[PDB]
Amino acid sequence: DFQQRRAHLANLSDEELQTRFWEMAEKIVDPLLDLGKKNTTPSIERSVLLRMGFSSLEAKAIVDKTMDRGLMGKGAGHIVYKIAKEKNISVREAGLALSEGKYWDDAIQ
Amino acid sequence: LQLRVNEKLDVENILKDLDKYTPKRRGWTWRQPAENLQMGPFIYKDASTPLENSVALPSAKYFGDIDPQPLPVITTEIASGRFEDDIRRMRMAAWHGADHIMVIRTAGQSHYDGLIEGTPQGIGGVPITRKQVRAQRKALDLIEEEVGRPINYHSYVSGVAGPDIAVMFAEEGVNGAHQDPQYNVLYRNINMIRSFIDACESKTIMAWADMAQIDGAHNANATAREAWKVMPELMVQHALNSIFSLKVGMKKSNICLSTVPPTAPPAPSMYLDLPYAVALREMFEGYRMRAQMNTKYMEASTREATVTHVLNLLISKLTRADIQSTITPDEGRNVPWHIYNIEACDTAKQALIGMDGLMDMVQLKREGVLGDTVRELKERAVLFMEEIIEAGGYFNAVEQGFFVDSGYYPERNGDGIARQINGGIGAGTVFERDEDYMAPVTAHFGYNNVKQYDEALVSEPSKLIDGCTLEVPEKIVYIDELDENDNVNVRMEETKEFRSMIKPEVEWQADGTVLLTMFLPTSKRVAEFAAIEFAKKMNLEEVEVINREVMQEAEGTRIELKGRVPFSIDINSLVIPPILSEDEIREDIEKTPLKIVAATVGEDEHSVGLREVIDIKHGGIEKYGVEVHYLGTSVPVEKLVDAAIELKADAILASTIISHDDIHYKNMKRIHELAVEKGIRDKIMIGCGGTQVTPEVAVKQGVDAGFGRGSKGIHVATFLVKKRREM
Ligand code: B12
Numbered sequence: 066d067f068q069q070r071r072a073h074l075a076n077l078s079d080e081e082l083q084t085r086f087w088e089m090a091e092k093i094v095d096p097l098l099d100l101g102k103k104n105t106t107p108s109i110e111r112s113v114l115l116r117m118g119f120s121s122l123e124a125k126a127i128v129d130k131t132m133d134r135g136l137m138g139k140g141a142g143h144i145v146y147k148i149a150k151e152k153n154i155s156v157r158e159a160g161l162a163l164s165e166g167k168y169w170d171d172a173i174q
Numbered sequence: 175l176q177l178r179v180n181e182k183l184d185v186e187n188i189l190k191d192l193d194k195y196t197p198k199r200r201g202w203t204w205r206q207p208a209e210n211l212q213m214g215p216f217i218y219k220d221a222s223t224p225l226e227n228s229v230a231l232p233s234a235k236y237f238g239d240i241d242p243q244p245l246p247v248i249t250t251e252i253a254s255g256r257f258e259d260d261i262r263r264m265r266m267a268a269w270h271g272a273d274h275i276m277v278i279r280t281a282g283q284s285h286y287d288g289l290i291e292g293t294p295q296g297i298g299g300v301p302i303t304r305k306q307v308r309a310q311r312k313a314l315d316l317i318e319e320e321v322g323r324p325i326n327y328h329s330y331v332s333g334v335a336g337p338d339i340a341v342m343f344a345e346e347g348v349n350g351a352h353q354d355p356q357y358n359v360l361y362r363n364i365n366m367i368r369s370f371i372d373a374c375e376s377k378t379i380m381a382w383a384d385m386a387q388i389d390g391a392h393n394a395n396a397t398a399r400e401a402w403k404v405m406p407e408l409m410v411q412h413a414l415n416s417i418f419s420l421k422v423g424m425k426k427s428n429i430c431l432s433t434v435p436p437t438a439p440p441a442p443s444m445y446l447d448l449p450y451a452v453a454l455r456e457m458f459e460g461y462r463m464r465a466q467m468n469t470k471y472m473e474a475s476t477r478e479a480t481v482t483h484v485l486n487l488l489i490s491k492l493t494r495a496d497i498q499s500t501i502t503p504d505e506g507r508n509v510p511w512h513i514y515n516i517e518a519c520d521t522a523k524q525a526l527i528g529m530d531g532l533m534d535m536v537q538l539k540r541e542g543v544l545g546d547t548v549r550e551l552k553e554r555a556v557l558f559m560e561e562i563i564e565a566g567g568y569f570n571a572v573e574q575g576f577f578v579d580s581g582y583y584p585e586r587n588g589d590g591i592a593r594q595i596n597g598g599i600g601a602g603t604v605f606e607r608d609e610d611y612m613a614p615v616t617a618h619f620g621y622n623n624v625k626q627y628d629e630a631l632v633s634e635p636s637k638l639i640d641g642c643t644l645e646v647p648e649k650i651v652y653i654d655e656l657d658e659n660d661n662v663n664v665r666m667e668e669t670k671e672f673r674s675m676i677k678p679e680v681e682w683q684a685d686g687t688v689l690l691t692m693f694l695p696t697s698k699r700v701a702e703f704a705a706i707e708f709a710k711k712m713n714l715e716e717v718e719v720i721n722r723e724v725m726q727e728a729e730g731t732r733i734e735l736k737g738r739v740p741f742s743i744d745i746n747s748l749v750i751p752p753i754l755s756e757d758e759i760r761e762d763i764e765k766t767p768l769k770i771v772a773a774t775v776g777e778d779e780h781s782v783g784l785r786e787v788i789d790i791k792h793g794g795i796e797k798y799g800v801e802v803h804y805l806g807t808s809v810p811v812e813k814l815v816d817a818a819i820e821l822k823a824d825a826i827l828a829s830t831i832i833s834h835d836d837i838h839y840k841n842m843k844r845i846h847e848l849a850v851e852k853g854i855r856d857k858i859m860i861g862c863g864g865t866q867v868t869p870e871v872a873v874k875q876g877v878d879a880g881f882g883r884g885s886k887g888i889h890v891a892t893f894l895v896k897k898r899r900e901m
């Protein structure tokens with residue numbers, strides 16, 4: 066079977082074969098890079114928070130409430146932040162606070 | 175601070191203050207080539223800068239105790255479940271030339287949906303948290319300043335918590351990591367969508383930290399029914415991960431393929447792996463190779479594993495390998511013990527040094543058969559690509575079971591692991607980003623609207639909050655412990671004691687494990703159980719037979735065993751008693767000449783004994799330049815003493831084998847008297863030997879020394895240069 070499927074490559078130079086290889090690669094993954102550019106996940110958002118200076122604990126509080134609010138799309142660290150500037154407090158406070166129900170109504174507006 | 179090459183590693187002191195700790199270095203480090211290097215009496219072609227402190231291979235004692243270091247970075251795996259005992263093993267590993275510590279995670283940490291805190295006891299791996307990464311990354315910082323050469327700390331950024339660990343790794347200076355979107359899908363059944371979006375963020379973080387990135391393709395050989403057929407799948411997987419990491423933003427010099435020589439002997443292993451290795455190197459020019467040793471086709475024999483690793487090591491030499499991960503020769507037998515980790519490191523050092531300069535002498539016949547198979551592999555890799563594409567890209571092919579298929583592609587048996595694109599762990603946790611989505615952090619891959627706040631910050635989103643934790647280590651929250659039972663401090667207490675009592679161990683402190691090896695003249699099933707009994711009667715606890723080798727179905731069976739020794743011992747009770755090298759001996763007879771008369775005396779015809787400690791073959795005393803006037807056998811004791819003065823000799827060496835009626839002790843007493851009488855007893859060493867001579871009994875006859883069963887020139891020459899000095 067393999068003897069026939071290999072027919073149309075038989076002519077390619079060893080380096081044209083190589084060229085073909087890597088562009089099919091790039092062609093297979095770009096759609097994946099795209100999914101990546103325009104979506105988010107729970108783990109990604111935890112890591113934004115971790116970066117903003119929260120613990121792994123606090124961070125899975127914000128993110129786990131942010132999903133229950135359909136607010137994911139805005140980014141859990143964008144909530145923390147606009148809630149921070151709105152009631153004009155610190156990032157670690159607006160965040161600390163969001164971990165237990167505080168300021169979610171305000172958020173949703 | 176500190177670390178004296180003779181003071182044990184202070185684990186308790188290291189864990190002290192894991193909150194104030196920040197890493198000296200960052201990112202990956204290679205070995206520095208030391209072109210045309212002179213070590214001992216030799217010139218090295220493919221060597222790296224030497225260590226400033228180390229343990230040379232045992233055979234180096236004959237060479238000035240030189241320890242050449244190879245060019246590839248050498249890797250040692252290290253995890254037991256307790257990262258504390260594992261720090262001691264790392265210091266060990268370093269001195270033996272390893273400069274890459276890879277740390278496996280407790281089974282399935284990949285499924286953990288978040289970091290975990292503190293330092294639990296883990297299961298077939300170390301659990302990865304911040305306390306533990308700071309402890310190990312802090313210890314390596316001493317160990318490294320000790321051996322005098324940087325060491326790369328390395329681990330795993332996998333499963334549903336990708337971006338967290340990665341982030342944690344960057345905060346805390348981990349030097350490299352495994353990361354492959356597909357390990358996640360194919361092997362851990364994690365939703366392929368969730369997963370491929372995790373890896374974008376992950377890799378971006380890791381590019382930011384200049385980290386080395388190793389992929390997951392080796393895991394293919396693990397699942398292959400017949401590894402030598404999984405080659406097309408391998409190149410493909412390697413390629414997706416390479417190209418993926420490349421477009422996220424990593425450097426080709428920071429992207430490594432994880433390649434393993436497919437098969438192992440009785441397989442014609444070289445002849446099956448060399449084309450794949452060569453094709454792989456062709457196709458991925460400019461990328462790094464991390465060569466891993468085989469672990470699939472591997473059994474219970476440390477020897478059998480060790481030999482296969484040398485062949486694996488050869489492939490790397492005939493091709494390329496920027497990293498060379500070793501495998502513990504005991505991997506197929508049990509959890510890696512301290513010693514076998516050192517074995518692997520010394521082996522790779524030994525083999526790579528051994529074949530230093532090899533590619534100046536040997537080349538591949540890149541045409542002929544080699545060059546043809548190479549083509550066949552490339553064409554199959556390419557065909558496989560197109561099959562993937564002509565089914566609608568990656569997500570589809572996986573659903574349609576193209577992966578972990580047990581056939582040689584094209585051939586497809588229809589038994590690959592097939593994943594649901596809607597299924598797996600964390601299915602339905604992908605959320606569409608919004609036009610107003612935002613992240614005030616560094617190293618964020620996806621689409622990020624910082625513009626709705628300030629244009630000037632698009633490229634520096636972290637300015638929005640005056641630095642995230644990548645700029646500002648002080649914003650990192652350090653959780654110490656969450657459990658107050660399962661923790662490192664609790665585990666220190668369990669063995670507080672041993673820190674003047676002493677016992678054997680293999681992995682954890684004071685676990686009293688020892689290896690026991692025997693041979694039993696009976697069948698395999700029986701000798702297994704026989705050896706358990708022997709094992710118990712030696713007071714061994716928790717005995718397990720960890721390897722049966724048949725010699726002959728009937729003649730006998732070799733058996734290895736581990737067992738726990740249920741007791742300690744004390745240093746302070748030990749009865750420990752406080753010699754001239756072949757060269758001093760030679761340098762002495764060199765400057766002051768030594769003339770000897772030697773004879774088998776009496777009516778004795780047994781000549782071989784004395785020829786033996788005389789003849790150069792078995793290190794007799796001709797070897798050291800002693801001048802020996804052999805008189806022959808049956809020489810009358812008078813005739814010997816006569817010759818001694820005739821030839822102005824310095825020593826009489828008489829032999830005496832027949833020992834019936836104490837004739838051997840008498841013949842000596844008569845040599846001493848013939849000597850005293852003739853006024854030369856004081857200026858002549860009289861030495862005697864024979865099967866039935868007891869040194870001390872002979873000294874009471876009046877001869878300066880006796881020699882018995884199993885003496886050698888070294889003893890005789892030593893006695894001759896020592897005794898001579900006295901006078
Ligand atoms: C082969 C042999 C012979 C050969 C020897 C050939 C030859 N050219 O040497 C011949 C010669 C065939 C022989 C003859 C006899 N031997 Co025979 N011989 C043996 C045998 C088997 C060899 C031992 C031997 O060679 N040792 C190997 C050498 C390398 O080891 P070694 O002698 O112990 O020497 C070591 C140490 O002694 C030390 N050493 C020895 N001398 C000196 C000196 C100095 C200065 C130093 C530093 C060290 C040193 O270094 C050596 C180790 O590297 C032994 C049996 C035995 N297993 O011991 C008897 C044996 C010693 N001989 C024995 C007998 C009885 C005889 C005979 C009398 C019997 C007969 N055939 O009629 C005859 C008579 C010999 C005679 N005419 O003097 C008996 C011992 C009798 C006794 N208790 O006194 C033995 C023990 C055999 C036996 N059980 O009956 N036999």
Ligand SMILES: C[C@H]1O[C@@H](n2cnc3c(N)ncnc32)[C@H](O)[C@H]1O
Nearest residue numbers: 290291292293294655656657658660
């Ligand atoms: C069973 C396990 O859960 C973790 N874990 C997570 N949160 C806590 C907590 N608040 N208290 C104790 N352990 C916790 C551990 O560290 C672990 O070993």
Ligand SMILES: *Cc1c(COP(=O)(O)O)cnc(C)c1O
Nearest residue numbers: 782783785786789790791792793
């Ligand atoms: C090593 C060796 C021997 C050893 O035997 P001896 O009888 O003790 O000498 C003999 N012949 C050769 C050629 C050897 O190389």
